[PDB]
């Protein structure tokens, strides 16, 4: 009894250069190699990639962020490669101290290098967002991917930009460090009277747990009905087959729910985007409107 987690047989044909529509083909690369390793689980083909202006702006901008942090990590290691690898998780690029408020006037060694790195990260993410929109437009597709990605951008923007501004200093932002961003996260909860009492944090968690429940069920189901070509979801939407019927009936007989092949993808996008949506509201309201979620919770309001 074969389970369809790994392919039993790979087949390969000519490289697929992809659909054209209104795409500027001058800006697609050539195809990369074919990975047989990847091809046990999914597609074997690497490439082509599209790189126009926003692509290169984003890629350059994102490397500058990455290098700006790494230059500061080397500096902290005293330029010793042994100390760099030993302490990698412990280095941190900290924002400016509370004194300097929302000013760009802090020295490199006390928060200016943080601001530089953040500027590069700001350019990198927003250019990448325009890119998810334009790549969809060129192919005549809905902008679902761009609007879903904005949900993620919302929480990132709250954490590093919108909240620090409302609180009146960059000191409130997140440091670029593996262990240091973990400590910040734990510190944040303690200083705000325990996030478990933040109702938005509670919902955020419900949606995170639910994203795992839903992808577990959805993935499991499509594999369970792949013996009727179930993973061919678009043609099953246009022309319901026994795969869509059996998938619907599993859900109905189990827990009395209705699920269409299209409808389950609406559950999927929303379960996911509501994680960071509710999340960013919960963080935005912390220390701006609510000092202490315990105290708030006692009054309920």
């Amino acid at each position: 009894e074969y389970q369809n987690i790994f392919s039993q047989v790979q087949v390969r044909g000519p490289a697929d250069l992809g659909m054209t529509e209104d795409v500027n083909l001058a800006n697609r690369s050539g195809v990369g190699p074919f990975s047989t390793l990847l091809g046990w689980f999914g597609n074997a083909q690497l490439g082509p990639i599209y790189l126009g202006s926003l692509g290169v702006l984003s890629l350059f901008s994102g490397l500058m962020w990455f290098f700006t942090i790494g230059i500061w990590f080397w500096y902290q290691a005293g330029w010793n490669p042994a100390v760099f690898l030993r302490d990698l998780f412990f280095f941190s690029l900290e924002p400016p101290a509370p004194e300097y408020g929302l000013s760009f006037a802090a020295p490199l060694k006390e928060g200016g290098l943080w601001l530089i790195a953040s500027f590069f990260m700001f350019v990198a993410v927003w250019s990448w967002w325009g890119r998810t929109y334009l790549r969809a437009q060129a192919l005549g597709m809905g902008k679902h991917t761009a609007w879903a990605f904005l949900s993620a951008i919302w929480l990132w923007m709250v954490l590093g930009f919108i909240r620090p501004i409302l609180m009146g200093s960059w000191s409130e932002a997140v440091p670029y460090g593996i262990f240091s961003h973990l400590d910040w996260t734990n510190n944040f909860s303690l200083v705000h009277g325990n996030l478990f009492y933040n109702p938005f944090h509670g919902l955020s968690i419900a949606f995170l747990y639910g994203s795992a429940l839903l992808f577990a069920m959805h993935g499991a189901t499509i594999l369970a009905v792949s013996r009727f070509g179930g993973e061919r979801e678009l043609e099953q939407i246009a022309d319901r087959g026994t795969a869509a019927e059996r998938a619907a009936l599993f859900v109905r007989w189990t827990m009395g729910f209705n699920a269409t092949m299209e409808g389950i993808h609406r559950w999927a996008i929303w379960m996911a985007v509501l994680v960071t949506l509710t999340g960013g509201i919960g963080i935005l309201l912390s220390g701006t409107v609510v000092d202490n979620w315990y105290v708030w919770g006692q009054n309920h309001g």
Binding site: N4, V23, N43, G142, F196, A212, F215, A224, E262, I269
Partner: protein
């Protein structure tokens, strides 16, 4: 009542137990033997939670809490009022979960589909049994288990966590979080991609899986494919919960000190242990 297409699927057979005795529906819901077992175990467990509410002196759902036995009971039975009800309810909850899984198996057999869903669910049951059974038995008391109440179970998470310092430092917990974050990123993309193709720009024809593959190649230079994303989703979410169970089975058993101090294995490796400067020099 039936979906327009449902009658042809409502045939006899597929049951694991009882032959045709419980082989019927109540409205949309398939029953089967494990439907009856699930109802028995659920009703019994709800009765016992109400009994717990009486003894505690509150009907408020935001206050009702059923606590495990205290540590000095070890792995013995306990008086109902002081952890015995938690013990019977835990047997009931386990019976209801396993019955629900075997019922999904009966539904899979009648529909002639794979058993991937009940298999995926068995991982959630594993995680539950880790917290209430495997970890407590390894640690020597039921009292290390979590209480059944809306806010009290959150106190237990907070207290259990902060027993080991900042629980972020548990390395299995880092991996588990990564799979949870990645699962949700993948679910967002999968939903968005299928809907962007089925629901294109106004007045345009439905796109094809070719457009879906093309969009991802254009964006990031790789496309896992329509079979691959469903394999990936099942794996990310199952892995998240595997590493979750693992991060707690090792906490209190092989490791009972502060988790941050565990990371000194890396820092005190002999070749860089004594080199001055950096953070740890």
């Amino acid at each position: 009542a039936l979906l327009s297409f449902e009658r042809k699927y409502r045939v006899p057979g597929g049951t694991l137990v009882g032959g045709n005795l419980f082989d019927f529906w109540v409205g949309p819901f398939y029953v089967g033997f494990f439907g009856v077992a699930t109802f028995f175990f659920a009703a019994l467990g709800i009765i016992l939670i109400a009994w717990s509410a009486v003894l505690q002196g509150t009907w408020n759902p935001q206050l009702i809490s059923v606590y495990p036995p205290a540590l000095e009971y070890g792995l013995g039975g306990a008086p109902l009022a002081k952890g015995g009800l938690w013990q019977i309810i835990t047997i009931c909850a386990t019976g209801a979960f396993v019955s629900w899984a075997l019922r999904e198996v009966e539904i899979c057999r009648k529909l002639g589909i794979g058993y991937h869903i009940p298999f995926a669910f068995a991982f959630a049951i594993l995680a539950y049994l880790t917290l209430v059974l495997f970890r407590p038995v390894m640690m020597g008391a039921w009292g290390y288990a979590f209480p059944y109440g809306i806010w009290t179970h959150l106190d237990w998470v907070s207290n259990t966590g902060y027993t080991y310092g900042n629980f972020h430092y548990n390395p299995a917990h880092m991996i588990a979080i990564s799979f949870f974050f990645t699962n949700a990123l993948a679910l967002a993309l999968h939903g968005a991609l299928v809907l962007s193709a089925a629901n294109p720009e106004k007045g345009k024809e439905m796109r094809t899986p070719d457009h879906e593959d093309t969009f991802f190649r254009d964006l990031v230079g790789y496309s896992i494919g329509t079979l691959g994303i469903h394999r990936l989703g099942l794996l990310l979410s199952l892995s998240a919960v595997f590493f979750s169970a693992l991060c707690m089975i090792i906490t209190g058993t092989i490791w009972f000190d502060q988790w941050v101090d565990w990371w000194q294995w890396w820092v005190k490796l002999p070749w860089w242990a004594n080199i001055p400067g950096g953070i740890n020099g």
